[PDB]
Amino acid sequence: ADTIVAVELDSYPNTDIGDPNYPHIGIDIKSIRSKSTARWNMQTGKVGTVHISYNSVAKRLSAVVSYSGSSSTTVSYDVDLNNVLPEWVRVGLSATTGLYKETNTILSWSFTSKLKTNSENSLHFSFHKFSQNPKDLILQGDAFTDSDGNLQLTKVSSSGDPQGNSVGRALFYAPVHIWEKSAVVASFDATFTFLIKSPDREPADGITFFIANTDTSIPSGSGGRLLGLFPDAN
């Protein structure tokens, strides 16, 4: 199986796999059962921004979600990611719909990763517009770029309606080196902005930012509640 570290913006409460009974943000370490959650005050039709950071001295993964002029939600978890992840990884975003649905529109995505050895290596990307044929992104499943230059992670109809039972992802083309033998310290920071809309009072299922093995693929069975990240709910 893949090795997965994610931050979930989870809009649909699946109590049976341990979601709290409200939309929330989560830190996912090699499971869909979030190590740490916080109440997400979901605003449909409103553009949101998520920021994520981590470094290897502090060993705390953190995320904050907000909407313009509105309050913020934060989530943190103490974890040494270089004991969890392999040295080389790819970074990406995922989303799903299920029985219920929502547009999973990414308007922009940026990412910075640094590696210092005791003897600096660096990668940075930002997309504020996605191109119609994004050579620097590996698009998986249902994911596509639209005419407005937005990245849609899940299916929508020509008229704009989201569809159910969809899974999509986008990975940055280049692998990222997150730890080394002579390494002193590593860190990363990521930002995206997103637009989720639904014709459902209980929109579903959510969006993640994730880091994984370089050859990561959409696992069979990973639909709806599993956010296109895990083959099961263990």
Ligand X SMILES: OC[C@H]1O[C@H](Oc2c[nH]c3ccc(Br)c(Cl)c23)[C@@H](O)[C@@H](O)[C@@H]1O
The letter for the amino acid at 173 is Y
* Contacts of 173 by beta carbon, 8 Å cutoff, 6+ apart: 135, 136, 137, 138
Q: Residue 225: phi, psi to the nearest 5?
A: -60, -20
Q: Candidates 15, 21, 83, 118: give the one binding a copy of itself (CB under 8 A).
A: 118
Q: Quick one: tokens of 29?
A: 């370490």
| Closest among 118, 94, 59 to 206, alpha carbons compared | 94
In the complex, the smallest distance separating the C-beta of residue 223 from ligand X, rounded to whole angstroms, is: 6
In the complex, the smallest distance separating the C-beta of residue 154 from ligand X, rounded to whole angstroms, is: 11
Distance between CA atoms of residues 54 and 189, nearest Å: 7
Is 14 annotated among the ligand-binding residues?
Answer: yes
Which of residues 176 and 223 has its CB atom nearest to ligand X in the complex?
223
Residue 149: which region, alpha, beta or left (left: phi > 0; alpha: psi -120 to 50)? Answer: left
Which of residues 77 and 210 has its CB atom nearest to a copy of itself in the complex?
77
Which of residues 22 and 125 has its CB atom nearest to Ca ion in the complex?
22
28 binds Mn ion (CB under 5 A): no
| Closest among 78, 112, 98, 69 to 206, alpha carbons compared | 98
Q: Which residues bind ligand X (CB under 6 A)?
A: 12, 14, 97-100, 204-205, 223-225
Q: Candidates 5, 7, 9, 10: give the one binding Ca ion (CB under 5 A).
A: 10
Q: Which does 230 bind (CB under 5 to 8 A by kind): Mn ion, ligand X, Ca ion, none?
A: none
Residue 194 exposure: Cα atoms within 13 Å on the Cβ side:
30
Total number of residues binding Mn ion (CB under 5 A)?
3
Distance between CA atoms of residues 96 and 11, nearest Å: 10
**Is 166 in contact with 155 (CB distance < 8 Å)?**
yes
Q: Which does 217 bind (CB under 5 to 8 A by kind): Ca ion, ligand X, a copy of itself, none?
A: none
Which of residues 63 and 139 has its CB atom nearest to a copy of itself in the complex?
63
Q: How many CB atoms lie within 10 A of CB 234?
A: 9
19 binds Mn ion (CB under 5 A): yes
- Residues near a copy of itself (CB under 8 A): 49, 51, 53, 55, 57-60, 62-64, 66-72, 74, 76, 116, 118-119, 182, 184-185, 187
Binding site members for a carbohydrate: 12, 99-100, 225
Binding site members: 8, 10, 12, 14, 19, 24, 34, 99-100, 205, 225
